[PDB]
Amino acid sequence: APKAKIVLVGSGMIGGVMATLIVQKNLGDVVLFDIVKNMPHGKALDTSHTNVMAYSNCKVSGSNTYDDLAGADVVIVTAGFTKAPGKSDKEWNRDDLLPLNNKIMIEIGGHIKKNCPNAFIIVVTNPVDVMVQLLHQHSGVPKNKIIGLGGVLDTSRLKYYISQKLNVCPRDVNAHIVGAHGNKMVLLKRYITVGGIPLQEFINNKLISDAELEAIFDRTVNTALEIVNLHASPYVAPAAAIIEMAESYLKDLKKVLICSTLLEGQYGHSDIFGGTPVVLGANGVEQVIELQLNSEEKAKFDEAIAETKRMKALA
Amino acid sequence: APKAKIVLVGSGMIGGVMATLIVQKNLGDVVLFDIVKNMPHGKALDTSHTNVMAYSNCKVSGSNTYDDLAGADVVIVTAGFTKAPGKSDKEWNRDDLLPLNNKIMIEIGGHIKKNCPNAFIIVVTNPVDVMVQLLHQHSGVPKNKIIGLGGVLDTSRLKYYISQKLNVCPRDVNAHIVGAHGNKMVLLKRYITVGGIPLQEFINNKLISDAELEAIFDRTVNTALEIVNLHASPYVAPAAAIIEMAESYLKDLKKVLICSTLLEGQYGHSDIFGGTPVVLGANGVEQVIELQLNSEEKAKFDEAIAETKRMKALA
Amino acid sequence: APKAKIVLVGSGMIGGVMATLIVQKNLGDVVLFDIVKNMPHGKALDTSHTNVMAYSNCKVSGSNTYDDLAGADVVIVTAGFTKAPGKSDKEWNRDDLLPLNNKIMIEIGGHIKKNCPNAFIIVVTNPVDVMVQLLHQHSGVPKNKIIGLGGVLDTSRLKYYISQKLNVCPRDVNAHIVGAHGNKMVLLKRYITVGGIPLQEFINNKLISDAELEAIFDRTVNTALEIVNLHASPYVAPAAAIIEMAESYLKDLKKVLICSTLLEGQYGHSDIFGGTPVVLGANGVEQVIELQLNSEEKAKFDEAIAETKRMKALA
Amino acid sequence: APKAKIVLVGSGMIGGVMATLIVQKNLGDVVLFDIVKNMPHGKALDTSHTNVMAYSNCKVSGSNTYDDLAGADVVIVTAGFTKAPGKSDKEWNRDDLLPLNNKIMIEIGGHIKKNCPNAFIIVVTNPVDVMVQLLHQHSGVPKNKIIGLGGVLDTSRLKYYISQKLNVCPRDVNAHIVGAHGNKMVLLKRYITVGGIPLQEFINNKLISDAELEAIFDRTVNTALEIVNLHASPYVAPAAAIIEMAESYLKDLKKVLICSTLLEGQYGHSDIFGGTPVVLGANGVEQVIELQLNSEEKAKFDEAIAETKRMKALA
Ligand SMILES: NC(=O)C1=CN([C@@H]2O[C@H](COP(=O)(O)OP(=O)(O)OC[C@H]3O[C@@H](n4cnc5c(N)ncnc54)[C@H](O)[C@@H]3O)[C@@H](O)[C@H]2O)C=CC1
Ligand SMILES: NC(=O)C1=CN([C@@H]2O[C@H](COP(=O)(O)OP(=O)(O)OC[C@H]3O[C@@H](n4cnc5c(N)ncnc54)[C@H](O)[C@@H]3O)[C@@H](O)[C@H]2O)C=CC1
Ligand SMILES: NC(=O)C1=CN([C@@H]2O[C@H](COP(=O)(O)OP(=O)(O)OC[C@H]3O[C@@H](n4cnc5c(N)ncnc54)[C@H](O)[C@@H]3O)[C@@H](O)[C@H]2O)C=CC1
Numbered sequence A, B, C, D: 001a002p003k004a005k006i007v008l009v010g011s012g013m014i015g016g017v018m019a020t021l022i023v024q025k026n027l028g029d030v031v032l033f034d035i036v037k038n039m040p041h042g043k044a045l046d047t048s049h050t051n052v053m054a055y056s057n058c059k060v061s062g063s064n065t066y067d068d069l070a071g072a073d074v075v076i077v078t079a080g081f082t083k084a085p086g087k088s089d090k091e092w093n094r095d096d097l098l099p100l101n102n103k104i105m106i107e108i109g110g111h112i113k114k115n116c117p118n119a120f121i122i123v124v125t126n127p128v129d130v131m132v133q134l135l136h137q138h139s140g141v142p143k144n145k146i147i148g149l150g151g152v153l154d155t156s157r158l159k160y161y162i163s164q165k166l167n168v169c170p171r172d173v174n175a176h177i178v179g180a181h182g183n184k185m186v187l188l189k190r191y192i193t194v195g196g197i198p199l200q201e202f203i204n205n206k207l208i209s210d211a212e213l214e215a216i217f218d219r220t221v222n223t224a225l226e227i228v229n230l231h232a233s234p235y236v237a238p239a240a241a242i243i244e245m246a247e248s249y250l251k252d253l254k255k256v257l258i259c260s261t262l263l264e265g266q267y268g269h270s271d272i273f274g275g276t277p278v279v280l281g282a283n284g285v286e287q288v289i290e291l292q293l294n295s296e297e298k299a300k301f302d303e304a305i306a307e308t309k310r311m312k313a314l315a
């Protein structure tokens, strides 16, 4: 068919949810690729039955062969590790895994360059703002054809927690988190709206306080940790955020979505990837939007980029 | 069933599209009521076949009997006239029809009070900010259970025209139009955002000019006239706006949506209906939001209310 | 974009509903073409506002220029007349309009051949089994790239009326109507199922009688007439049936759908179009399914083809 | 709200997918209940973020307290074990776990009877045709308010495998599997259709052979085992099948769906639960459909019931 071909490089917890949502939305044929033998065939078979319940017609097939990248329209990379082996859940962060996940990105980039150089790529593997640039360099793809997950996920949390306090539809809260995904993410209080109205109006009316919002900000930064400490793992919202990005691409919706992208002067920064609103459509990254940040907000953005540069050197 | 019962009081051009979208979305059983004999049975029959294509199960039935209001969960009022008889398309506006449409609202309010006093009501008949209050008074329903169409429709236009210039997803433009539906509608430049970012940033970047935006504002105010002068009539977007409101109610989405509602001190005004953001959920109008307007914006709001009061006196 | 381009050749009652449903489903960009000046621009403008309510991004534009066929992926033809001028609603049928609608198909086929020879075509104009073949011959397109509306619409009626009697989901009734669209349509009692079970089981159980089913058959054949006699016109279900066909094509769903298609030996017949189940996907008509009819059912099929051949000669 | 409250009794692999699909479809508020501390709070938090991406408004909350059953509209039971501890993946089946899962059903039935006696119940825990009856007896609910998962899932497999061979939309294959869920499931060759046409027509045409269909039948029976042996586990299709059932209930769709239900004379059998087509709407099990099986098919149904009776005695 001229159905899109979507290759999930990595068939773990995020991979399984992505496959499920692609069939629900009838977005295209799916390949679950992994290095683990047999497992991706098992998940694919299970998932393929749901075409019946969903009134869809998407193939879902497993793969242990890199050459099945051939002909891909969209490549989604989750391959790598989720925790360090021998650290505890209380101390979960990023430093020894870096050269190893570097190696995985380099291997995957080579297979992309050979098999699907015209594919649109989404990178997920952490630390994402480092790994996305490494894959960019080794795959050879144009700068408008590769992005990383960060802001759609981080803002989903902030938007959701505010909507519960104000008793409004979650999607009616808009908000911006920039710079990097991780503990230096920059939460922009000045860019939060409710039904398109400045959040400051709701603060002046005593519907939500400054102190409540400080606690929600800390909650947003520490959410992945909060979920690990409740004896679970974040993969459902991560999968839904990635599928919103891939769907904007495939259907040429042109949504404004905060993603990691090559900076060429925005915010003062070049030769690095960082999180900012972009427009995603049929030509990929159609527009990179630069927020007109003030000096206090710029100083936080600078701290986030410096941490990406630090980990890049260790990779 | 405990399926919702939705009674469309008026089975004209807007009525037919509403029925179509209710079946597409499987929102509830539908009654097409009108004073014209047989016609609502014909439209209902046609529309009922689409359950097959849509995988829905909504009854659609016509009615020429007011007592079929009994048991309604939602009542949508389009009944009345669309043009004055003997004015031309160039001079389309509001003044001789007012006592006549007054009479129609009074008759309908009596049948509501008798047959479905606990229904949620949406009024459409023009001039809407006058007719909604008349129906409120004659039906006896609580102030949180009746609204008028205006701002969802007017802002759909403004949001759409800006999104075409900036090349972004239409729903990513948010904007506010308040006070009344009609030629005195108040377009608030300061409350426009794109992907949650102040529109002023896009003006500073020369992506859209102040002059372009002035022309888009005039276009928005004159859209209903522009469509009449192209040898057609606005009913498709009006139907879609009303169904977004009714769906927020029925599914308890709690969306922020600009509608006509009883003012009790907001903006300085009492004892009148005017357009403002509200929250619609299972308890009806759950919240009335007051924008913190400046004195220049308040002065325009005052002009809009004064025109509703003028036409109310003539009704 | 590589968004599909869908050109609606004819912007009347069916055209307006098709445009609405394409935006609801985000299926592609839309052109409303007609010979009436200005009207298609008016309908397009109205419809374009609904992208906001629907969270879609489909352009909708009017046209009075045939060359806007250039680049079309799908062409849907409703152009022509709906009643004869000077016959009454009681005597509604097909004979004086035939050479005139012949002329319209010939003109449209020439513009297709010049501007979009690789488009997938759906013909609606009545009498459909005649007009579709005329357009096939004058447009030059391959036999797997042109079909006519009939069976999806006719069976929607039969399926719906049975589902109301048995109190089951409308889409759980399956049924076949073949040969031609119109008063000689062949309703196949032996091929009706409910939840995939032979309808005869429900007859043996007295849940529905043979006599009830005879009355439902007559109702199905006379539905378009029943709607005309209730002071309305069938266009909503016709639009929904056509969009189910076009959506199967565009999304490569491969649904089994009864349409008018070139016969090459099925049922004994060649060199004519008639209604039969086909499979619609990305390569168009992927399969033509021949029902293994008995001699009594074949004799009714023969009567339907003979009536198409009669009207073809008069065209 | 009068939003439905859906309590998932069991927050394992099937539970997590059900919660995800409920938010995607905006079906109601969700409680993830389990005996494992903290884990259901973690999964709920992750899942709650997806309201943003989905434009939904469903609460998702964890629970370790049985009394949170209070006010439930729908109760879905997955609680229990998935494998026996100390058997291998090659020998996966049903016998030592039975009294233990008996105990779990009895405990859950007591809490239902106290907290939500008017809830609609779906039982999943294996062996399902035994566990559903045990829960029926201990919960006290009416026979039209409790069902077990089996046939929607088993037939999803058979329908899907046939659709891949014939190259048609998966949902266009209809088929029936009855009696019990498990190795004695009864696959009815005579009740298979493609686009509502008897499958025998496609066999006469050599599009699919009798031998191919025998291999597909064996594949369908052994699918859960095939997935275990590929180093994965079936939970995605099971979750989608259960949500199709619960959605038919909540929205009064009245779909025909094969489920485990109390038999009162159908097929010769009373005082036991077994798989058969039923109609699910707002009053629960609205109709129990008895297939007019022949003596050879009845003999297989009898073997399936005998195996449910055997395991019931050991419980
Ligand atoms: N950017 C973001 O906003 C977020 C990123 N993540 C990251 O996503 C990644 C995946 O998370 P989960 O799916 O939960 O991990 P997971 O461990 O369940 O799955 C990862 C899979 O990658 C496979 N793999 C290893 N090398 C491979 C190769 N060369 N090719 C293909 N597959 C390979 C593993 O066998 C495993 O099945 C992690 O690095 C995690 O930290 C998680 C949440 C958010
Ligand atoms: N508030 C808003 O944003 C908008 C309001 N409108 C208004 O909506 C109204 C309807 O517009 P259209 O449907 O295009 O009009 P339409 O004329 O096509 O339909 C109105 C229907 O009301 C019927 N009617 C008259 N008295 C009735 C009664 N007592 N009970 C039931 N039916 C009765 C008529 O027979 C007719 O079928 C008009 O007043 C129009 O100006 C239109 C667009 C937007
Ligand atoms: N095949 C089927 O199952 C069905 C077929 N129909 C047929 O569909 C056709 C359309 O029905 P409606 O939309 O209700 O008709 P309508 O009369 O409302 O619209 C037809 C439009 O075609 C336009 N037209 C005439 N010549 C044209 C040209 N050369 N190029 C473009 N436009 C041209 C007219 O100005 C008009 O706007 C009729 O022939 C009708 O009998 C109706 C129902 C079902």
Ligand SMILES: NC(=O)C1=CN([C@@H]2O[C@H](COP(=O)(O)OP(=O)(O)OC[C@H]3O[C@@H](n4cnc5c(N)ncnc54)[C@H](O)[C@@H]3O)[C@@H](O)[C@H]2O)C=CC1
Pocket (backbone or CB within 6 Å): D009, D010, D011, D012, D013, D014, D015, D033, D034, D035, D036, D078, D079, D080, D081, D082, D104, D107, D123, D124, D125, D126, D128, D148, D149, D150, D153, D181, D234, D235, D238
């Ligand atoms: N009927 C059918 O068509 C199918 C049935 N199943 C069955 O579904 C059941 C669940 O399967 P999975 O979710 O993959 O299992 P899973 O083991 O991942 O989850 C089961 C959960 O039940 C919990 N649990 C134990 N006692 C409980 C109690 N008293 N209250 C609440 N939670 C309790 C466990 O801690 C666990 O989290 C199994 O019995 C399995 O065989 C699986 C597929 C199909």
